[PDB]
Amino acid sequence: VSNVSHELRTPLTSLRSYIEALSDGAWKDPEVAPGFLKVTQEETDRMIRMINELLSLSRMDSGTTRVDMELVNINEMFNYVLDRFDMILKKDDNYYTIKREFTKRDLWVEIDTDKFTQVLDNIMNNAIKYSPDGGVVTCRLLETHNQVIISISDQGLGIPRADLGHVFDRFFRGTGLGLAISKEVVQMLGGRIWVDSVEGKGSTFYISLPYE
Amino acid sequence: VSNVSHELRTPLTSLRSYIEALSDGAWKDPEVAPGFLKVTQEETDRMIRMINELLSLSRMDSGTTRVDMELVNINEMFNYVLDRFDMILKKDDNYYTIKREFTKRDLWVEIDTDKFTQVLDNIMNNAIKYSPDGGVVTCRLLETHNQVIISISDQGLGIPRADLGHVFDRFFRTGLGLAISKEVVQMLGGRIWVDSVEGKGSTFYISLPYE
């Protein structure tokens, strides 16, 4: 599409600029060279991600993806993920807190650990990105009906109620595929994923899993 | 589809390696840094081209590509392209010759100068790259029947007659230049094809409506 290849074109040409800058001499100058190099690094990793997600949406949707399913404890799992995010957030130069509300009963669900961790990641990420003033990101885990409900909420920028359903279609606004990922994955893990937001009260992404 | 994302994945991870190398300190060292940067440069430009080709087949497949058609002199045109290639080959640190045989009647055809230039380029490229022992790349331009015939030949590695037809199918060995040229020429209302004998050589033909 004019869309995808151009959305790949952008960081490429970006990279081209920084690289050109170094090549023409910037590499010799210590005031800019590490910095420019860092930008190049980031752009590259970004593109590898975009590529990989593109690929997973090629193999998952079209649709031959071996999904490694284990009976995992989501209490621990969610705590691991949130730990990693707390670690990235505490070494920042800006500012974010993680408000955990996990039920006191240990829950076990049939999920792919790696693919679900990539889910939780993508959603936490998109949350922090739609929360410009910072503050608290709220993460809940509790059961109902034999749904295990994970919910992740930000009190940042709202989300248009006119477009609330299409957040899960490909590239709806660090890559812009994380939602497509999580939706597809969760759907495959046999759960349901959706969003509820009031502009600009805040945003909340829901995940539901078959409990037993 | 996994193919495309793998052919994009490779130079990316390449880039990652070189970039990482520099970032960890290589930039401070003058013996490797210009060189590593040259690699990064090349890989990046490469990826941009691959993107563009992908995109041109995205607009061509869906036929959403306005092809800017002019009545051009292919004699001069081919001479321009071959001039550029002669400059590229003469400013090299390695070996290649351009054998021009252009008919002495000036021919004019309805073509998109730029897209046909990318054709001639892609094919000349496939010639120079597929000529491991080096030597001469042969470029002919002559009319027949009201065909304008361009032919470009290399005396390098042959091309298997068992798979000789699929050189123009998507991603047969950036790796899309052939798909480009084929599609473009078809769109310019001409015909494109290949004839090769391993390992005598390879020869790409282009035919255009002459009048």
3-class DSSP state for residue A194? strand
User: How far apart, in whole angstroms, are the C-alpha atoms of residue A97 and residue A82?
Assistant: 10
Q: Does domain B1-66 have CATH number 1.10.287.130?
A: yes
Find, among A153, A164, A156, A168, the residue nearest to A200 by Cα.
A156
Q: Beta-carbon neighbour count of residue B76 at 10 Å? A: 13
Q: Which residues pair with A203 in a beta bridge?
A: A154, A197
Min Cα–Cα distance to chain A from B62, Å: 10
- Per the listing, tokens 């050189």 go with B167
Task: Give CA angle at A165 (A155, A151), nearest 5°.
Answer: 45
Helix, strand, coil % in chain A, rounded to nearest 5: 50, 25, 30
| Chain B residues touching A40 at Cβ < 8 A | 19, 40
- Amino acid sitting at position B194: V
SS3 label, residue A116: helix
Main-chain phi, psi angles of B125, to 5 degrees? -55, -55
Residues 6+ apart with CB under 8 A from B64: none
Does residue B29 belong to the interface with chain A, where contact is any CB pair within 8 Å? no
Residues 6+ apart with CB under 8 A from B166: B172
CA distance B192 to chain A (A): 26
Q: State the span(s) of chain B assigned CATH 3.30.565.10.
A: 67-211
User: Chain A, 56-85: which have a CB under 8 Å from a chain B CB?
Assistant: 58-59, 62
Q: What is the DSSP letter of B27?
A: G
* Site of tokens 């649709």: A63
* Closest residue in B to A59 (Cα–Cα): B2
Contacts for B20 with CB less than 8 Å, ≥ 6 apart: A41
- Here the tokens at position A36 are 């420019």
On whether the CB atoms of residues B110 and B139 are closer than 8 A, the answer is: no
Question: Closest by alpha carbon to B107, among B187, B191, B210?
Answer: B210
Beta bridge partners of A97: A136
Where exactly does CATH 1.10.287.130 map onto chain A? 1-66
How far is residue A74's CA from residue A109's CA, in Å, rounded to a whole number?
7
CB contact under 8 A, B27 and A33: yes
| Count of CB atoms situated within 10 Å of the CB of B134 | 14
What approach was used to elucidate this structure? X-ray
Q: Span B67-211: which CATH code?
A: 3.30.565.10
Taking the Cβ of residue B94 and every Cβ of chain A, the question of whether any pair is shorter than 8 Å is answered with no
Residues A24-59, buried b or exposed e (16+ Cβ, 10 A)?
eebbeeeeebeebbeebbebbbbbbebbbbbbbbbe
């950036």: which residue's tokens? B174
Q: How far is CA A141 from CA A13, A76, A188, in A?
A: 42, 11, 20
The Cα A5–Cα B63 span in angstroms is 17
- The closest of B64, B45, B58, B3 to A4, measured between CA atoms, is B58
Q: What is the DSSP string of A65-97?
A: -----EEEEHHHHHHHHHHHHHHHHHT----EE
Find the helix or strand (DSSP H, E) in which B96 lies.
Answer: strand B96-102
* Among candidate residues B176, B60, B26, the one with its CA nearest the CA of residue A40: B26
B/e letters for A92-117, b = 16+ CB within 10 Å, e = fewer, are: eeeebeeeeebeeeebebebbeebbb
Q: Which chain A residue's Cα is nearest to B24?
A: A34
| Backbone dihedral angles phi then psi of residue A31, each to the nearest 5 degrees | -85, -25
Which one of A6, A8, A16 has the shortest CB-CB distance to B44?
A: A16
Closest CA to A137 of A88, A209, A203, A77: A203
- As a whole number of angstroms, the distance between CA B36 and CA B14 comes to 11
Nearest to A125 by CA among A94, A156, A149: A156
What CA–CA distance (Å, rounded) separates A177 from B209?
Answer: 47
Chain B residues with CB under 8 Å of A22 CB are 27, 37
Rounded Cα distance between B101 and B5, Å, is 41
Nearest CA to A135 out of A196, A202, A207 is that of A202
- Chain A nearest-CA residue for B36: A23
Q: List every span in chain A annotated with CATH 3.30.565.10.
A: 67-212
Which of A182, A101, A199, A183 is closest to A143 using CA atoms? A101
Chain A, chain B: beta-carbon pairs less than 8 Å apart: 82
Looking at domain A67-212, what is its CATH homologous superfamily?
Answer: Histidine kinase-like ATPase, C-terminal domain (3.30.565.10)
Give CA–CA dist B18/B28, Å, rounded: 14
